Amino acid sequence: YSEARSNYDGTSLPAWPAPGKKPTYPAALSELRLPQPRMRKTRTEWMYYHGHGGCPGKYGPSREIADFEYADGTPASISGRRFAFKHHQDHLLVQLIRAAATVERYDASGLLPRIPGTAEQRNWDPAIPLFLD
Amino acid sequence: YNFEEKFVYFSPFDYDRTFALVDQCLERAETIFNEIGDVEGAIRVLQQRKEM
Amino acid sequence: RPYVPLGEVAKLELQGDYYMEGGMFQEALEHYGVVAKAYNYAYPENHAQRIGIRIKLSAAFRQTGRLESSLANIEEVLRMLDASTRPSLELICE
Amino acid sequence: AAAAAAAAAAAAAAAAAAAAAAAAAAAAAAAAAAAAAAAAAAAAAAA
Amino acid sequence: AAAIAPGPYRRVGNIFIVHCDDHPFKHSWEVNRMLRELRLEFKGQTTIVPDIPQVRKRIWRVRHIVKVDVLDLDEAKALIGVPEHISFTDLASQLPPSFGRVKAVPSPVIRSKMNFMKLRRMRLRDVLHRDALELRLLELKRSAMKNDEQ
Amino acid sequence: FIGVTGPMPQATSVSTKSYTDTYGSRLRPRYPESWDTVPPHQPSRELL
Amino acid sequence: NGLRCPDALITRTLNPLLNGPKFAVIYCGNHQYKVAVGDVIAVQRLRVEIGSHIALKKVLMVGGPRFTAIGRPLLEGVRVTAQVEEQKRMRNVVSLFATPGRRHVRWVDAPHAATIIRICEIFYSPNVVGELDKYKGELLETFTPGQHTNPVYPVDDGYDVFRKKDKEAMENATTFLDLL
Amino acid sequence: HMVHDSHKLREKLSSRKGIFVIDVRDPGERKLNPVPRSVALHHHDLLSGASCPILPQQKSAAELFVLASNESRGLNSAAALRRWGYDSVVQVDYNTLVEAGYV
Amino acid sequence: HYRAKLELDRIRSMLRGRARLERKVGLKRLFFLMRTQTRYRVEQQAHWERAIVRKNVDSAAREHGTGWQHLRNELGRQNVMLLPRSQQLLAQYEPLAFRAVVELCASRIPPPPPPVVASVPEESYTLWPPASLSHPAARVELRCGVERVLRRGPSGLGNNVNELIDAWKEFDVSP
Amino acid sequence: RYRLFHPRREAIPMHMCPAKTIFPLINSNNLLVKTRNSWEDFTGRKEFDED
Amino acid sequence: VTRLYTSYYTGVLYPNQLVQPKQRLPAD
RNA sequence: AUUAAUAAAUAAAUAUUUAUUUUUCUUUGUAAAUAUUAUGAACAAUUUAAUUAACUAAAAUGUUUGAAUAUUUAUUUUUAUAUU
Lengths: 133, 52, 94, 47, 150, 48, 180, 103, 175, 51, 28
Hints:
This is part of a larger assembly, with 11 protein chains of 9 kinds. Chain B has helices spanning 12-15, 17-36, 40-51. Chain B is mainly α. In chain B, helix 2 runs antiparallel to helix 3 (40-51). The N and C termini of chain B lie far apart (35 Å). Chain F has helices at residues 19-23, 43-47. Helices cover 66% and strands 0% of the residues of chain I. By secondary structure, chain I is mainly α. Chain I contains 10 helices and no strands. The interface between E and F is small, with 10 and 8 residues. Chain E binds one RNA strand through helix 1, helix 2 and helix 5. Chain G: Keywords: Ribonucleoprotein, Ribosomal protein. Chain G: Belongs to the bacterial ribosomal protein bL21 family. Chain G: One of its GO terms (biological process) is translation.
C-alpha cells in the first residue's frame, strides 16, 4: 500500500527509545564552529539535517518514492526525468569514486605533499607553521 | 558542429531483442554444428543469420 | 487480481538478473524463486509474466547445475505458451 | 588551442596568486631583492 | 594503551565536497574559470573533488564563493556503504569510461567530433559483426568445395 | 571482477559458464523496467 | 483492517475511534492534495490508462472525525485508492512575450496536461507502539484512558497586575476526558 | 637533549613495555642504522598532523622519544609533538640506543 | 512582424466601446493585457498567493497560540513535510488535524532521527568460499528483501519468511 | 537567514543512492557495474505488465 | 557555452523513446 | 583593433560557411574562407605595484553619562525564529 522510506535499504535509526528513557534530541543550534553567534537552525537547515537537499522536492522520499501505484500492486513506469535523476545520482557516485581513486593514485605515486597547503596559502596564512628544513 | 545528429545510429541489437535472441541462438547452433563436425548445417544456419 | 508488492518483487527480479550477469547463479536462483512465487500468486494462469519468470528460473537452474529441473521448468513454460493466446514473439524466441 | 589555454591558465595563476606585493622600500621586486621570514616576536600556541 | 598504534600503517587521503553559495558570474573571469575547473557554474551546485594540490589551489582561489566539506577516504567509503577491503581504485577501474562528459575536450566542435566517432564506432560494431559472419561463411563454403573436390 | 576486459579463471569448475559466454555480449536480460527498479539502457551506448 | 498494538487496552480503546469517514493528505506530482472517499482531484499527468484502479503510495497525513495520524515525513499502512477518470488538458494559459524594441512576438500556449482522479477508498491500519507523553519526550509503559496524560492548569496567578483578564469561565474552564 | 644511558635503558625496559620511539631520519640513514622497535615518521608529517591518530591518546601518560641525527631536526619534531599536545618528549641518538641495548 | 491578430480578434468581444468596436484598438488593448498578465503571472502572482497562504496559516497559528514563524521552524524540526498550501487547507477544512500538528510541534516529542547510512554486513567480510551454496551476504540481502515484500502490505504470499526464502525448492525437481 | 552553516555531505545526501545502486553485487565480493551512463541512453517507457 | 551537467538535467525528449509494442504471435 | 611608403610571423570586432579526437586531477571556443566596419572624450591623480522568463507549486535577501540633573561637588536607568 503506502510507502515510507528514508534509506535505500529501508532501514531507519531507532526513533522511539525504550519506555521511561530520556529521548535523544538533535542539535538545535547551527553547525557554526564559533560559539557565537548562537543561532537556532533554519527550516532549510532542518530539511538538510533530515535528508532533503534544502527543498522538499530535491532529495529524499518525496523524490525517490513513486507517486502512484496500481491497486493490484503493479508499479509505475520509468519516466524520462526519473531515468535522468537516477543518472544524476549515479553521476554523483561516479564523481565521488573517481575523486577517491585519484587521491589513492596520487598517494601511491607519492605526489601528495607532506606540507599542509600550497605555496600561495602557506605564504598568505600565518596559521600554517614553517616547514623549512 | 552538432553533426552527430546527422549520423545518429540506433543498434538493432538494442531496439529489437528478438533479433538479438535469434542471433545468439544461431551462433550457438553454429557452434554445436562445428563441434559435431557437420558442415551443411553450419553453412545453412550461418547463411540464415547473415540474411537476418 | 490480488494485491502483491509487485514493485518489491520487481526489485528482487532485477537483483536476480544482476546476480545472473555477475555469475552468482545460486543467488539468482534464490531470488527468482521468490519472484516466481509472487507472480504465480498474483497473475492468472498462463500469463506472460508467469511464463517469463519461469523462463528465468529455468535459466538459473541450468546455470546452477540442476539440468533436470531446468528442463522441466522450460517444458512447463512451453506448455503454458501453447495454452496461452497471442504469445509474445520475443518471449517464445527466448 | 593548447597554447592559448596554457597561456590563459598562466595568466590567471599570475593574476590570482600574488595578491599583494611587499613594499618596494622594504624590498624592490624589480631589483630581485626579497625579504626573508622574521619569526623573532612570534608564538607557537594555536591562537 | 598510551602507546603508538602497534601495527602496519596506511595513508588515507581526503575528498572535498565543494558547494557554490554565491552567483559565480558576478565575479571576475578568473574566479569563474577556477569555479568551472571545480565544475561549478551556478549557485546551489555541489561537486566532489579529490584532495590534491591543484584542487586545493582552486578552492583557495575561490574560497569566498565555495563552502567546503571534508571526507576522509574512510568516511567516504562508509558513506557509500562498500566493504573496507574493496578499493576506490578497483571501483574506478570497473566503472565505464564513457559515463557522461568523457573529458573536457578543447572545444564543442571537438566534442561533436567525439560524439560522431562514438556513433561511427557503434555502427562499425554491427558492420564488422556482419562482415565477420560473411567471411566465416565464405571460409566454410571454400572448405566444403575443397572437400567435394577431394 | 565481472566487467573486466581480460579473461577470467575457470579452473574452479569446467561446467560453470559465464553469462557473457552463454548469451553473448550484445544480449542482456529483460530487466523489469519500473519506477522502483530502473535498469541500464542501450548497452551499445554504454560500450563507448 | 484496523489498528494494532501489543497493548490490548490501547488497541481496544483506539480501534473504535478509526471507524468512520477518513481524509488523507497525499503527495503526488510535487503537489499535496487533501482527499476524501468521494473527492475528485486534478493531478499532473500520470501515464495511466483511463478507468484504471490506482493507488497513492506516499501519504503525508491521515485523519478522521476522532483521530489524526501524521507522517514525518510519510506514513505506513495507509491504503488510499482512486480511479483514473480522465487524462486531458486543463484550460490553456496564453503567454505573450514581446519587447518594445525588437519586432519579435512569441505566443506560447500552455494547456497544462492533467489526470483527473476520483478517490474511491481510504483505509488505515496503524501499528502503535505505546502512549507518548507530550510535555516530556518519554513514552509511557502504562496507558490510562481515565487520566489525562498531560494535565493542564490555568494561567492567572495574581503576580501579573497588568494582565489582560478574560471572562472567568473561559479563563478557568476544565476540560473533559475524550476516552470515556 | 642528551641524557645518561643507564637511566634511559632502565626506563625503556621497565616503564613502557611497548613502542615509544619516533624516528625522523633520511631513509638511507635509517637503513644504515635501523631500529626495529621505533616507528619511522617524518618531521613534516608530525608538524602537519598526519601522525595524530597513531600517536598515543593519553597525552599525560605517554612519554615519547625522538631519534634523529640533527639536533635542530629533533627539536623541530619535539616542537611539533608539543604543539599537538605531547610535552613529555625526550631526544635520543643511535649511539645511546646501541649502548643501552634497545637496538 | 507577427502580432496575434486572428487570435485576439476572437476575444475582442470582451472589451467595451471603442476597443470592442474598432479592430485596431481592441487588438492593441488585448495585446497589452496579455503581455501585462504574463508579466504579473511570472513575477508577482506567486508572491501574492503565497503571502495570502502565509497569512492564513499565521492566523490559524495565532488562534492556536502559535505563529507562522515558530510553526514553520518546528515543522522543519519535526520533519513534517506539509507545504504552506497544504497547511492552509488543513487549517481551514480540518481544524482538529491542524491543532494536532500544532500540538505535535509544541510537545517535547523527539523529532525523527536522521536517515541512516548504508551498513556493510559482516557477511561481506566473511570469506567465500571458505577454502552449491550461497554467499551469506547475498542471503542476508535476500532475507531483507523478502521482509520488505511481506511488510509492504497484507499480501497473500504468507508471513513465513523462511517459507518464502525456500521458494525455489518448490519449483526444483528431485532427480 | 540565507547564510546556512550545514555540512555539504548533508547538502548532497547519499542515503537513497548508495554504492549498491551501481555495484549491486558489491556486498558479495562481486564487482559488477550496472550504471545508467547518460540521460541520452533512454530507450523509453516500457509497460511492466500486459494488463 | 559548454555544459558540465554538475546539476540535475532532465533528459531531452527524443523519437527513439517511443513505446514500441512488442510483436505478438497471431491468434490463429 | 589602429605602425602610410625597401628583406618585420599575425589588425581586431561582428556575421556567414567550414576545419583539427595530440597524453597531464579538473577545466578550456582554437583555426580557415568570405562580407562589412569613424557612434567618435578634455584635464588632474597614480603606476618599472594596487530588460531577458513554458505551466503548477516550491523558494534562504533583511532621543544623558569626556553628557545630563542638581548646589557653592553630589546624583542618574551606559540571541533566535520569520518575510522574493
